[model samples]
Target: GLWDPTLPMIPSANIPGDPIAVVNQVLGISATSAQVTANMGRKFLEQLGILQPTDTGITNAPAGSAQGRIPRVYGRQASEYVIRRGMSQIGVPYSWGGGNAAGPSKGIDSGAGTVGFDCSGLVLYSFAGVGIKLPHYSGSQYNLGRKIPSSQMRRGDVIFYGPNGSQHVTIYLGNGQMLAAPDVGLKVRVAPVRTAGMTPYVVRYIEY
Candidate 1:
């Protein structure tokens, strides 16, 4: 639904029975074996610290392991995780129209050959890590969240550029900085927020 506040925020949707499987499914990737999915899922959750090595096998994740418990890193608690995920790709190239829900992919046209994320791709991938589904279009993203005046923007908020924020987008990281996949050939990086063409308000998808 477009701009419908009636629906609940999707931050709590991170507890997939199979983290790897859910990630693959959400990314529109092909399937793998159940045994392999669970094995990788265990390692995935373990990497996320949802389950420690003490809670699962050293080499594999057993079925029904985390099934009985609720993960605490849901809802607003996931923002840092998303941000960290994006930060991990600091040196990755910025491909035009590239990237899926959680990682880099092939971009089109001039962006082809070089694999990486476009601005919106990075944002969508970051949020997707915490179970938020976002369309690839920056314009579409700008319209979903509530607006906070740019001066009052907080960490994790989205900063838009151009008219009505239809041109490009980036994520705020406080301290007068933002994280972005700035144009083709460049790598995703944290840089000072540029106010020249910035939108008047920053967008927030969590809590209002």
Candidate 2:
């Protein structure tokens, strides 16, 4: 019998990257403790007039907390949570790669507050808490994928959209609804697939 437990085997098969690590490395975002905590922070900012609360803001609050902890959930559940958290952050203003400021957890992501969030910004923020990280822009966000076709969409899949030149991101909820921050000075909210001309796709995460 031949067995080498310590032998490092090559990953001939493609493996996904660590979503949280990717976010930390690409930008600088740390995962939060819970959805309640994240939502509380969001509410606290809005309470101070630092950001505005919208439908996305309110709904995504719970989902944010959930997504932060449960890295692995059903596609529908993940997308629902992502949409809620991402949308809740709407109207928070564009900060150009905003996020935490400490270590890999505290890094830059678009549209992050005190930080900023564009479109991908919100997606990055929500995933950070769950140890899943993402970049700060729309195009780079698409790079997270193993390049699955758009027809095979699933939950937690990132749908990017924008004008011919611009790019934005949103998380897919079942039945075509999406959670997105949209653009500058916009509150987070849930909208149809084609809202604001966001080019939709089904980009899965590196992790759960």
Candidate 3:
């Protein structure tokens, strides 16, 4: 019953090129190739119900249940990779100027030996799972790629807050929720896409 082709599992070993490179090739997007096979391994985990929305929300809906509001993002697995990667860090603590493309690290102002993620740091780590590297600052991330209307956002897209290039960034999950690191004293978690009436700018790093 779980062998549906629509949500079929793709084998990573069968895919050629690096993890992010394979994602770019399969999704028809562009990304630099790195020397790591583990990327696909993690992406494979995303294919299963490991970090994806398989058991929660619409994915677990019963017969005749309304599932339209749920995000069923299709196409390139790269987008799934991004979402899954972000989901993996759901409980990690948020630290200012913390995290890198490789993984968690000391924050700039979080004192020594601090390991966590800030807004942009979380975004960087998520995208890096597929080998797409992003800058640590949220302002620079706002200008990295082409802009898309907030209304047209999809899963794995990055959303920015604030008027001028934004001061915070988050990974867009579907169903009007997003994965983010809100600020000091907060952990990485899911929250509404925007605060009040504020519509953050949306950007696509990996096209789906």
What TM-score quantifies how close candidate 1 is to the native fold? Answer: 0.65
Per-model lDDT: 0.62, 0.45, 0.58
Candidates 2 and 3 compared by lDDT, better number: 3
Segments in model 1 whose C-alpha atoms lie over 4 Å from true places: 1-76
Q: List candidate 2 segments past 4 Å from native.
A: 1-84, 94-96, 99-116, 162-166, 195-201, 206-208
Query: Per-residue alpha-carbon lDDT of model 1 for 61-130, expressed as tens digits?
Result: 1221322221434434556766887898898898876676537877666666877887777887776654
Report residue 156 deviation for candidate 2 (angstroms). Answer: 2.0
The TM-scores, one per candidate, come to 0.65, 0.48, 0.62
Q: By descending lDDT, how would the candidates be arranged?
A: 1, 3, 2
Candidate of highest TM-score: 1
Clashes of each: 0, 45, 0
Rank by TM-score (best first): 1, 3, 2
**Tens digits of per-residue lDDT for model 2 on 130-183?**
234444555655655444445666566776544321255667765777666444
